Design a protein around this nucleic acid. Structure first.
Ligand code: YQM
Ligand code: MG
Ligand code: MG
Ligand code: MG
Ligand code: MG
Ligand code: MG
Ligand code: MG
Ligand code: MG
Ligand code: MG
Ligand code: MG
Ligand code: MG
Ligand code: MG
Ligand code: MG
Ligand code: MG
Ligand code: MG
Ligand code: MG
Ligand code: MG
Ligand code: MG
Ligand code: MG
Ligand code: MG
Lengths: 143, 100, 126, 100, 215, 82
RNA sequence: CUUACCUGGCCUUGACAUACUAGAAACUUUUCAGAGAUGGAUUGGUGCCUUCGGGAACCUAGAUACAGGUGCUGCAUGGCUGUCGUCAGCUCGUGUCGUGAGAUGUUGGGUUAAGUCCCGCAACGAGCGCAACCCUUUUCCUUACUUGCCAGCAUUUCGGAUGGGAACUUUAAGGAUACUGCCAGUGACAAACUGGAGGAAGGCGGGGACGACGUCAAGUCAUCAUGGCCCUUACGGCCAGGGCUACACACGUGCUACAAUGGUCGGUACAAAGGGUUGCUACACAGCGAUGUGAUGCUAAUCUCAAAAAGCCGAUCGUAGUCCGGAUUGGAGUCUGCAACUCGACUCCAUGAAGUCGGAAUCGCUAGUAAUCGCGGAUCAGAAUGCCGCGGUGAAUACGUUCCCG
């Protein structure tokens, strides 16, 4: 805004696992206020991955989001360093967008699939991160 | 409105008032079961024979001060143009400007 | 033995709290019967879980009004006030946890000339 | 158990409250025991009225009218209570109904 | 921009209605139409008696009409014949029997409607409108108003193009809800058309609200 | 459609005209404005000129037309293409 | 019907007012011709006031001054309304410099939502605007105890149902609270701005009404009134049928979808606001159903519309123009209405179109908001995807003022 700065909107942690990151991803997944269906999808994916490979769901999700998180951006065109909140937001948006275009029937198992793909290193979100890195390198000199 | 239209309305109202009783009796006879189908048919035929302005379906609500046929507001018997003025002059008991 | 009232989005809850072993009843139904989500149950359980006194008291509750989330929030608020009445010294902990504050958010009214509270009609650009 | 029930309706809650308090005072002076007044829920009726004569859909006045109801119960009434209640005058704007 | 009605905006704030009676939804329309007819009849019949306010009540199967006038003698008549005739005529117009009451206005110069009526009469008799407005303003301010405003719109002096002009003196806080602000409109019918006259009189602020007014 | 319990609707004057026409063998067309009457079996073999708004179009009643309103055979609007 | 338009059939001091003259209580029962408007017959009756030698109400017949016009002029007007825009401005006295019109105040530093406030200054001060006074929402207290409520006692055909209680919820009147109040920075030491403690709530707490001087010869002679023009055997009035619903096309505003975060079926939860006596209807029976019949309680915190739906649990469908979508058409009905052809709503069986997310461009939204789900009402015999309201679930993002708009 022109005048003054608005404080960040506090988001209550996820009741089950007490993770603000999980709550933020859940809200990213939500559509039309259907929080119950979003919760079902996210908890189901976390439980599936935990059962498949024995790892703490919160730790694994944080580690994967770290890999998928970007590093640089360009603003209208001059490169700039992304802020921590925008980093996480872009990462989660990229994961959900790539899942939207994935070819599997459902969304929860199809989200777990992309989580494993990103953990391995090959995925649409990682490709988009590499593309933004390339474009930032191309416009590096400015600023 | 036009004075001819107002008088048409008044004439239709008078006709309805005149024929109210017989039309109701005929409807009851039509709807009666114990009576024979012959009597019910004759009642229906007479009902159809009643003059058209006897039917209340043809009455149109009109303002009451100007005869306007649109925006009637049954509760006040007045169209919006006069209702706004009468309310804002303080001549309609209990009516104020609403805010919530 | 102690009482509290809770309010959230047109919902009102009456909470009776007494020394007990951990029984909880809402409108003559168990928590899992009354609420179908896990989030509602966790919201109901937050205050005693924080106080580490879940199995210390018995809860008899009636509620009416609003929806499921509102009813859960009202129950939490009522339980919080009942616990404060039982022991005022819990008030700092509960106020830190944010259970003391009564949420005053409510639905904004529809406005003349608008589809909703703030959504306008579409405006053709010439 | 020859109780009496009084129902008050009004468009002005101050007027209806004044009337109810007058009734309560009269009953207490006569010596009977009274229950109430109990506030019954209000009726709110709303209306939208175009302000322009020809065409401006968004330009409207919003009006409302309120009906307030009060209930009074008189129990164990003395013979002198009924005549005093009947004597009590009628205030404009406050409809009063009495049931024995 | 357009202004709200000063009387209407204050109907439940500091001023009373001109009609006091309860009715069911079925009887409300009949009562309203009969009351409006009575108002229309009374205005015409008492045009020359300097009548400002009319208050109508239907207490119980009856009618009470209070007329605020600056000439009670004209309405009363020599020995009450006029009031008796008026009472009979209103009892004819309204189904229930009716009673009439007179309220003497001691100060016509603080009554908005009487001022507007005088201005309209002068304009119809072709007095200069600027003189009329100045004299009315000074008369009201001597009467003791805390503020006065007068407006006149139309074909002034029979001009081909109409215009509007106004004069104010004192203070008139229209946006202040608790202000006592009398308001009135009036028509002057001249050979060239209609001239509208509007009068505002500010008489101070009412303190205490409706409870003070003792509804 | 009109409920079966009430039977079909035909104007009394039109019905009287049709009854007279069947009773006495006359093929003169019957002029009517009653577009809303329903065609009955008794009409078959007759000619009814039905008003359309400015004219009375002649219609020869057949067995196929039974169960129709007279106005269905007298179109009201005129159109031939833009 | 509304209806102001068209075709045809009709009347003429008129469907409606005042004045003059004569006869008749008004009214009321049945037919005939006509599409109806109309015309012509045919029944019952002679009140109410009276100084009774008459008059009141209402009709019929004559008569002219007139009635009648949604005909024209929104550029001849009143009243009413849109817009810049809730943008923050517009002024006036007296002093002051200037021969002068004028200036000043109202200009400058910050600050704010703001000509809001504090500082300077030959200006001093005040008005209409801003703010506040009004309505609604959040915390608590007093009064009130039903038709509304049920913590503790009992009685129970386990249903606050009963005896009962006045506690809690709620209903609705009247009050308290919040004021930078306290604290630390901060700033010209001031205004003001940030961060803490208590508090339900902390810096206009959230919404609503309230529209300054003025601008567009802006809108409305078809709500109404009104100057002046026009028509008067019609530009007035009555009636039956048709049209306002047309259809090679082009625009604006919406609803429903293109599916798996979903469709179908079975089971099972939780609202707020309104409406109801020529009205809403418990319950039983009949029907696949829209509905029908009988019957019951409600003039309503009492009876009723009423099933909240998204939600949760279980099974099935497995990416197909499909178990997605529901346009179009063929049959068969119901109800409201004198009457559903032109031209109603709804119900059942059959049919199953376009559509697989939409170019350039362009629109709304800063929080209980957007998105999404259902519920009510005014108009109204019947006829909402429109309008005006109500609640349920409930996000994302603001680095900043370079760029577009005002
Ligand atoms: C696009 N359109 C809405 C315009 C527009 O855009 C704007 C705008 N500012 O944007 C507007 O002003 C308008 O809407 C509008 O309102 C106008 C008028 O009234 C008007 C008028 O009344 C007379 N009157 C006479 O000639 C009388 N004569 C006497 C004898 C014979 C005729 C003459 C005349 F040229 C006009 C101009 C219009 C223009 C109109
Ligand atoms: Mg007229
Ligand atoms: Mg109608
Ligand atoms: Mg909503
Ligand atoms: Mg609300
Ligand atoms: Mg609109
Ligand atoms: Mg059909
Ligand atoms: Mg028509
Ligand atoms: Mg204009
Ligand atoms: Mg125009
Ligand atoms: Mg203000
Ligand atoms: Mg113009
Ligand atoms: Mg015109
Ligand atoms: Mg017609
Ligand atoms: Mg149309
Ligand atoms: Mg399921
Ligand atoms: Mg389907
Ligand atoms: Mg295709
Ligand atoms: Mg904003
Ligand atoms: Mg309807």
């Amino acid at each position: 805004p022109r005048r003054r700065v608005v404080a960040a909107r506090e988001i209550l942690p996820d009741p089950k696992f007490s993770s603000q990151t999980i709550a933020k991803f859940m809200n990213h997944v939500m559509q039309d206020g259907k929080k119950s269906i979003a919760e079902s999808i996210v908890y189901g994916a976390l439980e599936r991955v935990q059962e498949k490979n024995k790892v703490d769901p919160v730790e694994f999700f944080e580690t994967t989001l770290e890999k998928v998180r970007p590093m640089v951006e360009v603003k209208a065109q001059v490169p700039m360093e992304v802020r921590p909140s925008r980093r996480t937001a872009l990462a989660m948006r990229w994961l959900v967008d790539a899942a939207a275009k994935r070819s599997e029937k459902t969304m929860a198992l199809r989200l777990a699939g992309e989580l494993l793909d990103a953990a391995e290193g090959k995925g649409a979100a990682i490709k988009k991160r590499e593309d933004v890195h390339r474009m930032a390198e191309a416009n590096k000199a400015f600023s | 409105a036009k004075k001819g239209m107002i008088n048409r309305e008044l004439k239709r109202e008078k006709t309805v008032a005149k024929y109210a009783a017989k039309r109701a009796e005929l409807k009851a006879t039509i709807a009666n079961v114990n009576a024979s189908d012959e009597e019910r048919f004759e009642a229906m035929l007479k009902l159809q024979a009643l003059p058209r302005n006897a039917s209340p379906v043809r009455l149109r609500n009109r303002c009451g001060l100007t005869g306007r046929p649109h925006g009637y507001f049954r509760k006040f018997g007045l169209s919006r143009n006069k209702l706004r003025d009468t309310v804002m002059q303080g001549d309609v008991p209990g009516v104020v400007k609403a805010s919530w | 033995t102690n009482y509290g009232t809770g309010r959230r989005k047109t919902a009102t809850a009456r909470v009776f709290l007494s020394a007990g072993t951990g029984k909880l009843v809402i409108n003559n139904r168990t928590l899992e019967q009354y609420f179908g989500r896990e989030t509602a149950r966790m919201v109901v359980r937050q205050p005693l879980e924080l106080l580490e006194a879940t199995e210390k008291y018995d809860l008899y509750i009636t509620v009416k009004g609003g929806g499921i989330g509102g009813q859960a929030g009202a129950i939490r608020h009522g339980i919080t006030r009942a616990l404060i009445a039982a022991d005022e010294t819990l008030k700092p902990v509960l106020r830190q946890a944010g259970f003391v504050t009564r949420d005053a958010r409510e639905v904004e009214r529809k406005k003349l000339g608008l589809r909703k509270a703030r959504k306008r009609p579409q405006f053709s650009k010439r | 158990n020859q109780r009496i029930r009084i129902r008050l309706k009004s468009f002005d809650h101050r007027l209806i409250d004044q009337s109810a308090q007058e009734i309560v005072e009269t009953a207490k002076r006569t010596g009977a025991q009274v229950c109430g007044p109990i506030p019954m829920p209000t009726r709110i009726e709303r209306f939208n009225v175009l302000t322009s004569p020809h065409v401006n859909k968004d330009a409207r006045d919003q009006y409302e009218i309120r009906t307030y109801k009060r209930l009074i119960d008189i129990v164990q009434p003395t013979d002198k209570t009924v005549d005093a209640l009947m004597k009590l005058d009628l205030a404009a704007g406050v409809d009063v109904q009495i049931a024995l | 921009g357009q202004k709200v009605h000063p009387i209407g905006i204050r109907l439940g704030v500091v001023k009373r209605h001109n009609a006091n009676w309860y009715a069911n939804p079925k009887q409300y329309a009949e009562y309203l139409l009969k009351d409006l007819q009575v108002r229309e009849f009374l205005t015409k019949k008492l045009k020359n008696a300097m009548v400002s306010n009319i208050l109508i009540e239907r207490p119980s199967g009856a009618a009470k009409v209070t007329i605020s006038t600056a000439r009670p003698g004209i309405v009363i008549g020599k020995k009450g014949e006029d009031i008796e005739k008026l009472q009979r005529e209103l009892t004819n117009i309204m189904g229930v029997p009716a009673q009439v009451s007179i309220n003497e206005i001691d100060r016509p110069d603080l009554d908005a409607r009487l001022v507007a009526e005088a201005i309209a009469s002068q304009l119809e008799k072709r007095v200069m409108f600027r003189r009329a407005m100045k004299r009315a303003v000074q008369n009201t301010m001597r009467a003791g108003a805390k503020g006065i405003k007068v407006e006149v719109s139309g074909r002034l002096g029979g001009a081909e193009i109409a215009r509007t002009e106004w004069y104010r003196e004192g203070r008139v806080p229209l946006h202040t809800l608790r202000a006592d602000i009398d308001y009135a409109t009036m028509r002057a019918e001249t050979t060239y058309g209609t001239i509208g006259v509007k009068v505002w009189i500010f008489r101070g602020e009412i303190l205490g609200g409706m409870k003070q007014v003792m509804n | 459609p009109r409920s079966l319990k009430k039977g079909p609707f035909v104007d009394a004057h039109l019905f009287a005209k049709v009854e007279a026409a069947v009773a006495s063998n006359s093929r003169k067309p019957i002029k009517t404005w009653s577009r809303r009457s329903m065609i009955l079996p008794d009409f078959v073999g007759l000619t009814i000129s039905v008003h359309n708004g400015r004219n009375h179009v002649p219609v020869i009643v057949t067995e196929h037309m039974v169960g129709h309103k007279l106005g269905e055979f007298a179109p009201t609007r005129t159109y031939r293409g833009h």
